Structures are given as C-alpha cells and as structure tokens.
Write an enzyme that holds these catalytic residues in place. Structure first.
Site, PDB file in Angstrom:
ATOM      1  N   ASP A  75      -2.538   7.655  -4.259  1.00 39.06           N
ATOM      2  CA  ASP A  75      -1.112   7.568  -3.937  1.00 39.06           C
ATOM      3  C   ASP A  75      -0.198   8.282  -4.943  1.00 39.06           C
ATOM      4  OD1 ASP A  75      -0.572   4.323  -2.204  1.00 39.06           O
ATOM      5  OD2 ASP A  75      -1.443   6.228  -1.562  1.00 39.06           O
ATOM      6  N   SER A  94       4.542   0.740 -21.975  1.00 42.28           N
ATOM      7  CA  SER A  94       4.750  -0.647 -22.376  1.00 42.28           C
ATOM      8  C   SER A  94       5.148  -1.559 -21.223  1.00 42.28           C
ATOM      9  CB  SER A  94       5.835  -0.757 -23.447  1.00 42.28           C
ATOM     10  OG  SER A  94       5.356  -0.416 -24.734  1.00 42.28           O
ATOM     11  N   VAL A 150     -11.646  -1.614 -23.031  1.00 43.62           N
ATOM     12  CA  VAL A 150     -10.506  -2.416 -22.605  1.00 43.62           C
ATOM     13  C   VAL A 150      -9.890  -1.782 -21.353  1.00 43.62           C
ATOM     14  CG1 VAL A 150     -10.136  -3.158 -24.992  1.00 43.62           C
ATOM     15  CG2 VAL A 150      -8.779  -1.253 -24.079  1.00 43.62           C
ATOM     16  N   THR A 207       0.821  -1.202   0.000  1.00 38.81           N
ATOM     17  CA  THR A 207       0.000   0.000   0.000  1.00 38.81           C
ATOM     18  C   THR A 207       0.860   1.259   0.000  1.00 38.81           C
ATOM     19  OG1 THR A 207      -0.157   0.044   2.404  1.00 38.81           O
ATOM     20  CG2 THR A 207      -1.858  -1.165   1.196  1.00 38.81           C
ATOM     21  N   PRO A 236     -12.654   2.504 -25.150  1.00 36.48           N
ATOM     22  CA  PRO A 236     -13.130   2.524 -23.761  1.00 36.48           C
ATOM     23  C   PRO A 236     -13.269   1.143 -23.108  1.00 36.48           C
ATOM     24  CG  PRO A 236     -14.459   3.962 -25.173  1.00 36.48           C
ATOM     25  CD  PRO A 236     -13.588   3.158 -26.083  1.00 36.48           C
ATOM     26  N   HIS A 269      11.826  -5.981 -27.019  1.00 33.73           N
ATOM     27  CA  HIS A 269      10.672  -5.347 -26.387  1.00 33.73           C
ATOM     28  C   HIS A 269       9.621  -6.373 -25.930  1.00 33.73           C
ATOM     29  CE1 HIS A 269       6.868  -2.918 -26.403  1.00 33.73           C
ATOM     30  NE2 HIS A 269       7.648  -1.950 -25.956  1.00 33.73           N
ATOM     31  N   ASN A 311       3.163   6.912 -24.568  1.00 31.22           N
ATOM     32  CA  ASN A 311       4.257   7.680 -23.968  1.00 31.22           C
ATOM     33  C   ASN A 311       4.369   9.111 -24.492  1.00 31.22           C
ATOM     34  OD1 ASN A 311       4.854   5.211 -22.787  1.00 31.22           O
ATOM     35  ND2 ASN A 311       6.860   4.988 -23.776  1.00 31.22           N
TER      36      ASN A 311
HETATM   37 PR   LIG Z   1     -11.659   1.063 -19.966  1.00 28.69          PR
HETATM   38 PR   LIG Z   2      -0.925   4.470   0.221  1.00 29.08          PR
END
Ligand SMILES: [Pr+3]
Ligand SMILES: [Pr+3]
Length: 279
Positions: free
Chosen positions: A260, A224, A177, A16, A175, A69, A161
């Site tokens: 976070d 990626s 996926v 976390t 949308p 890659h 990127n």
């Molecule tokens: Pr989605």
């Molecule tokens: Pr946290």
C-alpha cells in the site's frame, strides 16, 4: 468498538485503505497488557490516561516529563482518545532529559531496568516496550535491545528520521526487535523516515495527534510516532491472545497491509501495521 473522527493514524490501522476516519477495534483494548514507554517520561496525571499510567523509573532529577515527547508517545500507545490500546497499563521510564536527549549508557540502563521490573508487575496478557529514540550505530545499544526482547518483552523501536538506511542507527539496526518506519495519511513513506532491510513494519508517523504535557494535545511527526502505534497494536493483539511478545512483530508483519505504501526503496518491506479487526 468504534471511535468516530479518530486521529487518522488510528483509523489507518483498522482499514485496508487510506482516507477513513473511524477507528474500529475490539473492546478488550489491550486490557491486561503492559507497555513500558522508555522516553522523556509520562505526564501520568493527564486525564487522557485515566489513571492507567504511572512513572516507574527516572534517570534524572525528577520523574516529570518536562518535554512532552514521552507523553505524546504514551498517548499513542494507550490514551483514551489518541491510543491504539485504550485500556492497557502504561509504565514510564525516563531515560531522556527534558530536551529529548539521552546518553547511550542511560538508555541501556533503562532497557535493562524494564527487563527486570516486569517481573514485579501483574501483566497477564504480556509486556511491550516502546523505544521512540536512537542515534548512531552502537553494538552496546543494540545488545541491550536484544536482551530486553529475549527477556520476554515485545520491543518496538523507531527506525529513525534520517531518510537513510536504518543499518547505521541504534537501536533501529538491532535485528531481533521490531523496527518501525513512518508513513503519512496518503500512504507515502514519511519524508524523514529511515528505510532498509532491517525495517520490520511501518506505522503512521506524519501529523500524529496525541497527548502533551500541561494536560494538552498536539500533532507532531516522526518515526517516534509510528513506533507507539506498533507497540500499542502488539499490546492489543497480545490481549486478544493472537500472538506473544516473541512473535508479535512477525505476526504484525504477517497480517499487515501489503504494497500500500509509496516511495518504498527496493529492499525495504512494504508493510503497514493493520489490526484486521472483524466485528
Ligand atoms: Pr526485526
Ligand atoms: Pr490496500
């Protein structure tokens, strides 16, 4: 189970908080699931894949990963040392050439291929596809990704990127996926990561150590790299029976670390992939 001195990305997905070094995960480790890595290929002979990787389709002269890659991404999905789902089955679909480039027609064919080919494989815990690729907006590319998802495959795609809104990139902007942005080890949005309303989730993407061709390893950066963290996490959770191909992206968002991340633009989810492993 616990892997000490794990790559920071693996540690991050089982914590976390940032800054930890141990990857905690259920020993089932994605066994019984299958992940198609649609990319430059996979060097299946790499000892890190332990015989669990195989090429199943290529759109070029060879099935060999002559770039690295695809092998790197597959390693983050399911290599022994660098993988999220360390016991999954990996399937390589080479839609990108050895320079890392590919035509949209070929990328679409590869997606359609996986939608069909999965019906000839034993994948009792479910099927995932990892697409660490993309370029400018294409409705045809988006539609191919939507079909693959609809066919019963958890589709994870890179946000891109471009440090821009992913709405202008494909298959990121589809949308239906699971569109994956990248973070770094200090929980900042990666400097290059796309953002926007269409992002579903973030995963570790900056300075990610994984497998490379020639039986080697290296650290590289990109959405990626974030994408296979999420693809591997989906496989892992599907093996645990906690979610399905249709619902895994949403489940991952449901259970993500929330708030976070820093430098997240207003309107972009502040959600970081998290396995919530409780031994
Ligand atoms: Pr989605
Ligand atoms: Pr946290």
């Amino acid at each position: 189970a616990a892997q000490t001195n794990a790559p920071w990305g693996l540690a991050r997905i089982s914590s976390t908080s940032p800054g930890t070094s141990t990857y905690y995960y259920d020993e089932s480790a994605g066994q019984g699931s299958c992940v198609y890595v649609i990319d430059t290929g996979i060097e299946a002979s790499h000892p890190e894949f332990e015989g669990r990787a195989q090429m199943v389709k290529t759109y070029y002269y060879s099935s060999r990963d002559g770039n690295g890659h695809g092998t790197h991404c597959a390693g983050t999905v399911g290599s022994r040392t660098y993988g999220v789902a360390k016991k999954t089955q990996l399937f390589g679909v080479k839609v990108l050439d050895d320079n890392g480039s590919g035509q949209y027609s070929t990328i679409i064919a590869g997606m359609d291929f996986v939608a069909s080919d999965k019906n000839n494989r034993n994948c009792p815990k479910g099927v995932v596809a990892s697409l660490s690729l993309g370029g400018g907006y294409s409705s045809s590319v988006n539609s191919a990704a939507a079909r693959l998802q609809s066919s019963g495959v958890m589709v994870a795609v890179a946000a891109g990127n471009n440090n821009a809104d992913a709405r202008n990139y494909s298959p990121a902007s589809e949308p239906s996926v699971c569109t994956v942005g990248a973070s770094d080890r200090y929980d900042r949005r990666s400097s290059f990561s796309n953002y926007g309303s269409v992002l579903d989730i973030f995963g570790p993407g900056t300075d990610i150590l994984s497998t490379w061709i020639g039986g080697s390893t290296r650290s590289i950066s990109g959405t990626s790299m974030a994408t296979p963290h999420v693809a591997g996490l989906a496989a892992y959770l599907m093996t645990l029976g906690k979610t399905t191909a249709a619902s895994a992206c949403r489940y991952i968002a449901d259970t993500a670390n929330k708030g976070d991340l820093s430098n997240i633009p207003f309107g972009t989810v502040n959600l970081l992939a998290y396995n919530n492993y409780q031994a």
